[PDB]
Amino acid sequence: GVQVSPSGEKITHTGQVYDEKDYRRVRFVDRQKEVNENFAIDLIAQQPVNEVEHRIIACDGGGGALGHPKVYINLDKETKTGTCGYCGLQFKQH
Template sequence: MAATRSIILRASSLNSLSRVSGSNYISARPASSDLKKIEDIPIHTGQKWDSDDKRLVRFLNTPKQVNTRYAIDLIAQVPPKEVEQRVVWCNGGGGALGHPKVYINLDKAGPKACGYCGLRFVKKDDHHH
């Protein structure tokens, strides 16, 4: 009895839907077939979706916003900090915006980067122990 009632309710829902849409059938055609092809913008990792990828549908009403100022390029513009110590520490500025304190050994020549934030440190050449 409940199954029969469910079928009758579904049939009446379809009838009212066909009256609203003005046709006697419901289209099962995917909506994405009517959409124009969207070109994707690559992100910092080089990832770019194909123009027929279904994930691009989220960018129909507004364009995809990609920040072209990548953090790795910005931190590379900061010159290394010259220090006199053999071992320095970095906490990323401290506080809530920083990172755990790490110690960086500068015994070997050349700048050494912090593993968290990328800041570079270099030991001054003229410093003697």
């Protein structure tokens, strides 16, 4: 979530802030700093872990198309979860 810096500037989803001593803060004077308040890194964490009875699981994101390329993930390592490099979802072996 956007949390403000000493100077009074909102931080972005990639930690960008004009140093308090920076002259580039002028462009915001009498204006605003466009920032997105929905952080994917948190919205995906809010999602739960899927469970499957198979040690290998295919992910596409939803619709066959409208999703992403079908990728296959392994679930032999009960220590952690199996994450998709496209959608961020994570699965377990039960």
